[PDB]
Structures are given as C-alpha cells and as structure tokens.
Design a protein around this ligand. Structure first.
Ligand SMILES: OC[C@H]1O[C@@H](O[C@@H]2[C@@H](O)[C@H](O[C@@H]3[C@@H](O)[C@H](O)O[C@H](CO)[C@H]3O)O[C@H](CO)[C@H]2O)[C@H](O)[C@@H](O)[C@@H]1O
Ligand SMILES: OC[C@H]1O[C@@H](O)[C@H](O)[C@@H](O)[C@@H]1O
Length: 528
C-alpha cells in the first residue's frame, strides 16, 4: 500500500496530490569531533530522533542526505513522517570507467535498494554529488554518462517508481545534460559573481531550466550562506547571522521564481569536519558554518538554532509558486499557485491597499486559482500577499512584484555574440560583443557586467564592469570585451547582463553562451 509518485506538469505528485518538497539538507554523524566519511559507521539513532523532531518543528516535510542510510536509520525516518531524498556515496573523484569502481558501486547500490525499497518515505534518489568539470573531461563524458545510466537503471528496477537525479552545482555543471535523469536538479548559490552577477540568481537558474526544456520537475538540492567568523570571498563565508537569514529567504523566493517545485536549503547544522579538522571549529573555513544550527563547543552534541531557522519556519507556512516575483504579464488573468501548510485558513492579495483576491482555505497543500488585475499601460505592481490563521491573524506577508499590461509590449533586450562562437580550439583569445536595444521608460542601472567563466574547478574566471554612461541616450548600446582562453578550458559559460528599472520593478537583461573546446562533451553536454 505504498505511495504512488507521478511526475507531470513539472510537479511531483504523491497519491494524486501536487506536493511541494519542503526539504532541508541533513547530515547525521557530523557532530563536533565526528567525520561521517572517516569514522567507524554508527547509526546514531538517539541524535537522529532529536534532529528529526527538530526538523518537523522547523516546518520541513522532507530531509535530503548525501550518504545512504542503514535500514535502522531509514525505519526511523519512515516512522517520523518526513520524506527522504537519499544520496548515494558514489565518490566523485574516482574513475567512473574503472570496472572495479563500477562493480563496487553497483554491489553497494543493490545492497541499499534491497531493504530501502520497503520504505516509501523515499521520494528521490541522488546518484552522485558534485562531479567536477575537469575530472569528467579527464575520465571522459562517456564514462560518466555510462555510469549514471547503470545506476539509474539499477534504481528503476530495484526500487520502482522512485525518481532519480543528481547533486550538481549550477555554477560548474550548467553545461551538463540532465535529460537521462527523472528530475532536473542543481545546487544553487547566489554570490553575485560570474553567472549570478550577469543574469541574477533567478534568471540564471531559470535559464538552465529553459535549456533543460521545461519537461520535468526541477528541484534545488542545496542553497544558503555560511556565517564563518572570516575566510571565503565576497558572500562565500563571513556572513552575519542576519545576512544568513535574509539570504536564505531571498534564495527561496528566487528559486521558486526559477520553476523549482522542491527545495533543499543547505542545511541543518554545522559540520566541523568539513574544513579539515573535526575537533576544531576553524574561524576561517566557510564550510564549517553553513548550519541553521550551531554547536557551542566540542562537547555540545545538540546545538541551538540561529535566526535563519525561525525565518525559514515562518516563510514556509505559505508558499507562493505563481505569480512569480519579477514576472512579466500581458493578460488581465494571472495564474495563482499556492502551497499552504495546515495553519493557513485565508489568503488575501492586495494592490495599493485594495483587496483584489480573498479566499478561505479549507484544505492544506496545493491550490490553483486566478488573479484579476487591471494594469494601465505598462504598470509595475507590488502584489501584497497576506496569510491568516484560524483566528484571522496574519502569520505571513510576502510581496510579488510584477510588470503588467493588457497588451504585448517591448522590453529592452541584451544579446551577445561570442568568439570563438562554437569551438574554443579555433583561437587562444576570446571576445564578447554585447548589444543592448534600449527602450525609453526603462532605465539601465549601473554597470554592464561581463563573465567568461572558464570552469577551472571552482574559479569564476574573468569578469568586467563596463560603464555605459557615455552611451545612455543611444537606441543601440554596444561593448566589446576580450578574454584569454586557458588551454585547459574545456567549456565556458560566456554571459553579460545589466540591471533595468521600470517604476519600482528592477530586473536584469542578459544573454548566455555555453561553448565547448572540442567534441569532448558529445555525450555529457546538453543537447538542445
Ligand atoms: O556522499 C557524497 C559525497 O559527500 C561529500 O561530502 C559532502 C559535501 O560534498 C557536501 O558539500 C556541500 C555541497 O553539496 C553544497 O552544494 O554546498 C555546500 C556549501 O558549499 C557544500 O558543503 O556537504 C555534505 C554535507 O556535509 C557532505 O556530506 C564527500 O566529500 C564525498 O567523498 C562523498 O562522495
Ligand atoms: O572555494 C570553493 C567553494 O566555492 C563556492 O562558490 C562553492 O559554492 C563551494 O562549494 C566551493 O567549495
């Protein structure tokens, strides 16, 4: 009598009902003094009970993991009521083409499935975490793609009806074909650099979903901020607790706006192990301070929640999927899509302090309806949503900003032409020629940003800020920027973008090219 999972209209459905995955990343075996990949493996059931209870009280309906649970650990999750997105420990730096590696991975996965298939709390498998561009280049995309297929197929037979995808960072694996998987997924971070500086976070991830083809559900397997005392660069590491909390909420809205119907904020609690020494909480390792919970000292096995925990719990009470923030509408009818928890009994939408939508909610979960708006010409509109509880008291406010008209209209447009256009082998030097078709009434703000992300490990590559002050009054605004191509660049994401404003509506216009060195990515690269 197990949960039927159906993927359609780019949503997960459980037992016929659309189901927004409100997950959180969760790693057991990562208390101070512990390292989950090196220590003798323990079930840690007492600490899991504490954690699973905390996570239910934090508002989540799902956990997301990196490493397979034992049967004992799975049964506890099963009995908790939470859903599980279970990662499999398939070492990313290993040779995917090595028959011993393949066989060990297959034997291990089959061992897991043999009991895991009894536990219907599992709603997705993640078959690998974070394969690096250069490594794939080195062992070949075919080795990679063949391994993914092998494991996908073993899961489809061993635990039927459960979707399979992977954990892949959007900043380094933008180029990758994800069409072999059942759902599209990225780890998504907003550090306002490279792709996220040009396109902005919303538009970057949405672009990838469009390139993917808008034909499967899309989820995020990670996002968030580190509150390390120091270390990192820009917004990576070294955030305040307030920055962390405000950042998760900005991320949550943005990624919904990119089409996500499942969310795995990163993550439950700090892992001191992650910067190298598990017994020490290093002041300058961003990676050891990503938790929504932190530990006081080496002996603290429990920890306490940081402000982000409470902001997230509050934010998740009522989710707005449509309309989307920074969306453009040319109809008077706007799709409304909500995912309410059981405490939301009424939703109101206001424009300029006037009710345009009111509805008593009698059942939790997904609901669709339509908003009627009445824009004059091209009208920027802050849509003020209000969620109320059973006592008619507001428990959440959220704005959705739209740009609306009853009639089709012109936006300013940014396109790029990139050289080499199609094959990096054709020269040692690149160019990005940007062209902005302006539109009066739309103000271009600040600097044009250019990114030539050559994908060398985590490094962003060259960027450039170009002033367009001297050109603001022209219909067509141009720029040409040059970049040296590293010999070990196998793929590049070349992009450009600028901020635009219409009344109080601010957004970005941008364009993007993904360009490969040779035919190395015939198998692994996205086919359009
Ligand atoms: O089980 C698979 C794999 O796990 C690795 O350890 C993982 C980390 O890779 C992971 O890293 C996070 C990213 O997935 C996410 O996108 O961003 C955050 C912030 O930058 C990263 O920390 O974190 C989890 C949880 O601590 C770890 O379990 C192993 O290193 C690897 O050997 C193993 O195959
Ligand atoms: O410096 C390396 C780090 O850079 C960040 O942008 C990534 O999100 C991290 O996962 C990575 O380990």
């Amino acid at each position: 009598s197990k949960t039927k999972i159906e993927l359609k209209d780019n949503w997960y459905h459980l037992d016929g009902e659309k189901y927004f995955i409100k997950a959180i990343g969760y790693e057991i075996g990562a208390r101070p003094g512990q390292a989950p990949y090196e220590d003798e493996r323990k079930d840690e059931l007492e600490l899991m009970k504490f954690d699973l209870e905390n996570i239910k009280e934090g508002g989540y309906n799902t956990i997301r993991t990196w490493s397979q649970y034992s049967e004992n650990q799975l049964k506890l999750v099963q009995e908790s009521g939470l859903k599980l997105i279970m990662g499999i420990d398939i070492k990313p730096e290993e040779d995917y083409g090595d028959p011993e590696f393949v066989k060990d991975s297959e034997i291990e996965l089959k061992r897991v499935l043999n009991y895991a298939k009894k536990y219907d709390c599992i709603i997705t498998y993640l078959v690998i975490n974070e394969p690096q561009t250069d490594h794939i280049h080195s062992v070949t995309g075919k080795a990679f793609v063949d391994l993914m297929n092998t494991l996908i197929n073993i899961i489809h037979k061993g635990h039927p009806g459960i979707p399979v995808t992977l954990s892949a960072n959007a900043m380094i694996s933008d180029y990758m074909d994800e069409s072999i998987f059942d759902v599209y997924a990225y780890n998504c971070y907003d550090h306002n650099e490279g792709q996220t500086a040009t396109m902005g976070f919303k538009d970057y991830i949405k672009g990838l979903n469009e390139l993917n083809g808008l034909d499967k559900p899309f989820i995020t397997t990670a996002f968030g901020y580190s509150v390390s005392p120091e270390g990192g660069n820009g917004q990576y590491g070294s955030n305040t607790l307030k920055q962390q909390s405000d950042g998760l909420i900005s991320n949550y809205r943005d990624l919904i706006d990119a089409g996500a119907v499942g969310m795995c904020p990163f993550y439950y609690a700090d892992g001191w192990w992650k910067g190298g020494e598990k017994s020490d909480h290093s002041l300058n390792q961003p990676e050891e301070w990503f938790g929504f919970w932190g530990y006081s000292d080496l002996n603290d096995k429990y920890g306490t929640p940081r402000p982000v925990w409470f902001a997230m719990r509050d934010y998740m009470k009522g989710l707005i999927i449509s309309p989307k923030n920074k969306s453009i509408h040319t109809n008077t009818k706007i799709p409304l899509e909500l995912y309410n928890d059981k405490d939301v009994k009424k939703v109101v939408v206001k424009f300029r302090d006037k009710v345009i939508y009111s509805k008593n909610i009698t059942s939790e979960g997904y609901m669709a309806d339509e908003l009627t708006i009445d824009p004059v010409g091209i009208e920027d509109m802050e849509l003020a949503f209000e969620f109320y509880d059973s006592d008619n008291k507001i428990i959440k406010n959220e704005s959705i900003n739209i740009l609306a008209s009853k009639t089709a209209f012109e936006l300013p447009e940014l396109t790029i032409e990139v050289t080499p256009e199609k094959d990096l082998n054709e020269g040692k030097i690149a160019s990005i020629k940007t062209k902005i078709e302006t539109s009066e009434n739309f103000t271009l703000l600040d600097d044009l940003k250019i990114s030539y992300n050559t994908h060398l490990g985590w490094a962003i590559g060259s960027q450039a800020s170009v002033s367009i002050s001297d050109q603001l009054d022209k219909k067509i605004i141009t720029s040409e920027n040059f970049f040296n191509i590293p010999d070990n660049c196998w793929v590049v994401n070349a992009s450009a973008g600028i901020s635009v404003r219409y009344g109080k509506f601010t957004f970005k216009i941008h364009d993007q090219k993904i360009i490969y060195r040779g035919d190395w990515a015939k198998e692994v690269g996205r086919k359009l």
